[PDB]
Structure 1
Amino acid sequence: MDVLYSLSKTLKDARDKIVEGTLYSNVSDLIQQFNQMIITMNGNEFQTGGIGNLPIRNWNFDFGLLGTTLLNLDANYVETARNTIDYFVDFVDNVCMDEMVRESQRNGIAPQSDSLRKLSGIKFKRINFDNSSEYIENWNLQNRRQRTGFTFHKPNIFPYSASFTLNRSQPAHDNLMGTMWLNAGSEIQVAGFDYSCAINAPANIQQFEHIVQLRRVLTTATITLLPDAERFSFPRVINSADGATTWYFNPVILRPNNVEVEFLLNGQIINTYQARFGTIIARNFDTIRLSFQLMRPPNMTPAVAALFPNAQPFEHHATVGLTLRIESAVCESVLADASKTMLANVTSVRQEYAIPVGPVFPPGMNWTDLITNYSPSREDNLQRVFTVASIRSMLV
């Protein structure tokens, strides 16, 4: 991995720094590293495999070194370097794709493709130089059992889930009490509905709880909390739990009462926010507990009092909401996020070569299935393929 990354980084530096007219002293160390890579790779035969529709490709390395002959680089030097760099970049991209399309149940973090297994030999270790990118840095630290994290903007931590719970229900679905929620990506939009508007509640208070267990621990998370859930504030015709029939939802939005967001780690109260909205910070957590109350307004204007009668039928259903958005976080494990392209890159490579479903990942690299059952083996394989994808992104 470090050798493959070092090849990619050397090639990127060569493409960016070996430019016409540049001082010889701008590239001396780069030329030395590039010649070291050429020497190490010369005389070695590589094969990128024929898994799926990925074509089998054979790579031979017999390239002359780069000289150091002009004070300012000229077009001839750049052209020779470009020829060598193009061949090497093609080889590295093919190696990255081959590694990306494989997986293993037992040693998911270890190399899978023959080319990357060969590049893990001692003879190629000389190619290894600066490992500065976030993913390679995390890879190297993780190999040493050191604490490190990936920073995600809008981490895709919640598997898609749009469902409801009815705590009070009837066959006619006309006096319902329960909760709706959408947990999608970095967003949790929850709502608690009472059709009776807590007319018969002990203190005209109906308590609602939503507990979301994160599949991985998130640290240093910045979170936006908003009182209302816009997704559950318009009339809906909703299938029953079995799908036998459909019931009617006609929300009227009330201010959430006694709102408490608890971010829990190991069952301990790490962070607590009571009636606080806007931007909040969750230090380090793996569970979110949103508890909110629907309180019947003690004093109502005649129209509001007309909305909520003392008994059935109930045509306007009182709803309290909550929206939680993880704008950024840090996770010890790799995750899909809104800014990076690693999941997109791996999925595109797997789809474009018709890679058969393996024993580790879900079909089509479906992210909801992947995060739903985010096992340690899947974590290892995903980290491997994401690191390879980030290596490939430096050139392709």
Structure 2
Amino acid sequence: MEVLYSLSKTLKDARDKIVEGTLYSNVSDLIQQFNQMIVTMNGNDFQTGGIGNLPIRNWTFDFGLLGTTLLNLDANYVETARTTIEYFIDFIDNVCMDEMVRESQRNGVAPQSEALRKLAGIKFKRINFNNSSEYIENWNLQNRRQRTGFVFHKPNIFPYSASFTLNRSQPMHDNLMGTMWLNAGSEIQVAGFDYSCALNAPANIQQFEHIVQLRRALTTATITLLPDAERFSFPRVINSADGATTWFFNPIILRPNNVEVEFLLNGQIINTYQARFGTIVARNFDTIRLSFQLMRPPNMTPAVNALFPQAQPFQHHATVGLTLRIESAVCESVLADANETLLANVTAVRQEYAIPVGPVFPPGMNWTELITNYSPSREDNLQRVFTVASIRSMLIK
């Protein structure tokens, strides 16, 4: 697989650096690498595909070396090189495509795709050129076991989940209290609501808490924390917990007072921020505790006073909320983002040829069910296919 990345890197370099009129000084070492690759790959027969609709293909290499006597590259050099290069690019594209469609419940990181398995052999270890991209670097580190780090922008570490909890409930759902939350992508929007607006609460302060568990421990993450969770700040009609009936939610957005966010790793306080909105930083964490308070305002103009009575009806329903974006982070294990197209590449290649549901991955490879149960075998297979997709994207877009 390191050899596969070397193939992709050297083809990208060949396509970018073997151009009309470029000096041989610019491309001498690349030509040496390319000649070594040709010599190693000559006289082999690879077979690619055979799963789903992806068609079987046979690859045979008999290509001559590239010239070295030219001071400054001319046309004919470029056409000879290109007629070799399109063939090689097609081979590498098919190898990556066939690798991305295969799983393994046991020993995921080991190659699949008998073509790639053959490439892994000792014969082709002289292709190893360079391991520079982030994904191949982390692959090499894992084989060289030590800390791996993938930097992500808007990581979707949170599986999609919208739900509420009611700590005070009636069958008529007229005097409720509790929380609602959407964890989606890099967003945690949480909103604690009290229908009574903290009448009988201790000192007219109602404590709301929300616990979010990450499946992987993000590191050095910039987090944007704002008040007033928007999604839960307008009228809504919500099915009850058991679906029997539907209750009505008519927000009035109070300030969230003395908020307090704890970022925890293995259940110990790693970072804490009180009443500190805007850009904050989580050094290294595995869970987020958001604790805020709905404090009834003692002084009120008559409008607010009419909104919040001491009586039974409670026409308007007080609430507070927090929004928490993970703008960027660093994780030890591979994730989808809003920046890299690796998940899109793998899913597209699977759907194109209608790969049957495999042993390890969820059907359709949907990130919510993939991350909600993110076992080590799944992580191995995901890292393998994501590295392969990153390799493929070097040449094919």
How many equivalent pairs are there?
Answer: 396
Query: Does structure 1 residue 125 correspond to structure 2 residue 113?
Result: no
Check whether the contact 1:36–1:127 (CA below 8 A) recurs between aligned residues: yes
Instruction: Say which is worse superposed, 289-298 or 68-77, in terms of deviation.
Output: 68-77
Check whether the contact 1:213–1:288 (CA below 8 A) recurs between aligned residues: yes
SS in 1 for 2:116: helix
Report Cα offsets for 1:177-228 as digits up to 9, x if no partner.
0101000010100000000001111111111111000000000000000011
Check whether the contact 1:225–1:280 (CA below 8 A) recurs between aligned residues: yes
User: C-alpha displacement at 1:116, in angstroms?
Assistant: 0.8
CA distance in 1, matches of 2:159, 2:178: 21
SS in 2 for 1:394: helix
User: C-alpha displacement at 1:69, in angstroms?
Assistant: 2.5
CA distance in 1, matches of 2:378, 2:392: 21
CA distance in 1, matches of 2:289, 2:53: 46
TM-score computed with the length of structure 1 as normaliser: 0.99
User: C-alpha displacement at 1:72, in angstroms?
Assistant: 1.4
User: C-alpha displacement at 1:258, in angstroms?
Assistant: 1.6
Name the counterpart of 2:372.
372
CA distance in 2, matches of 1:332, 1:263: 17
CA distance in 1, matches of 2:120, 2:176: 62
SS in 1 for 2:132: coil
Check whether the contact 2:235–2:250 (CA below 8 A) recurs between aligned residues: yes
Query: Does structure 1 residue 236 correspond to structure 2 residue 236?
Result: yes
Report Cα offsets for 1:362-395 as digits up to 9, x if no partner.
0001000000000000000000000000000000
Check whether the contact 1:49–1:114 (CA below 8 A) recurs between aligned residues: no
CA distance in 1, matches of 2:71, 2:244: 81
SS in 2 for 1:179: strand
User: C-alpha displacement at 1:70, in angstroms?
Assistant: 1.9
Name the counterpart of 1:29.
29
Check whether the contact 2:99–2:385 (CA below 8 A) recurs between aligned residues: yes
**Unpaired segments of 5 or more residues in structure 2?**
none
Check whether the contact 2:175–2:314 (CA below 8 A) recurs between aligned residues: yes
What is the percent sequence identity of the aligned residues?
Answer: 93
User: C-alpha displacement at 1:130, in angstroms?
Assistant: 1.0
User: C-alpha displacement at 1:243, in angstroms?
Assistant: 1.3
SS in 2 for 1:180: strand
User: C-alpha displacement at 1:354, in angstroms?
Assistant: 0.1
Check whether the contact 1:206–1:295 (CA below 8 A) recurs between aligned residues: yes
TM-score computed with the length of structure 2 as normaliser: 0.99
CA distance in 2, matches of 1:167, 1:83: 70
Check whether the contact 2:148–2:333 (CA below 8 A) recurs between aligned residues: no
**Unpaired segments of 5 or more residues in structure 1?**
none
User: C-alpha displacement at 1:257, in angstroms?
Assistant: 1.4
Report Cα offsets for 1:114-136 as digits up to 9, x if no partner.
01110100000000011110000
CA distance in 2, matches of 1:213, 1:79: 56
SS in 1 for 2:348: helix
CA distance in 1, matches of 2:192, 2:4: 52
Report Cα offsets for 1:254-300 as digits up to 9, x if no partner.
00012000000000100000010000000000000000000000111
Report Cα offsets for 1:18-60 as digits up to 9, x if no partner.
0000001111000000010000000000001210110011000
Query: Does structure 1 residue 219 correspond to structure 2 residue 239?
Result: no
CA distance in 1, matches of 2:356, 2:256: 49
- Runs of 4+ in structure 1 off by over 6 angstroms are none
CA distance in 2, matches of 1:148, 1:108: 17
SS in 2 for 1:69: coil
Query: Does structure 1 residue 53 correspond to structure 2 residue 50?
Result: no
User: C-alpha displacement at 1:112, in angstroms?
Assistant: 1.0
User: C-alpha displacement at 1:142, in angstroms?
Assistant: 1.1
Check whether the contact 1:218–1:330 (CA below 8 A) recurs between aligned residues: yes
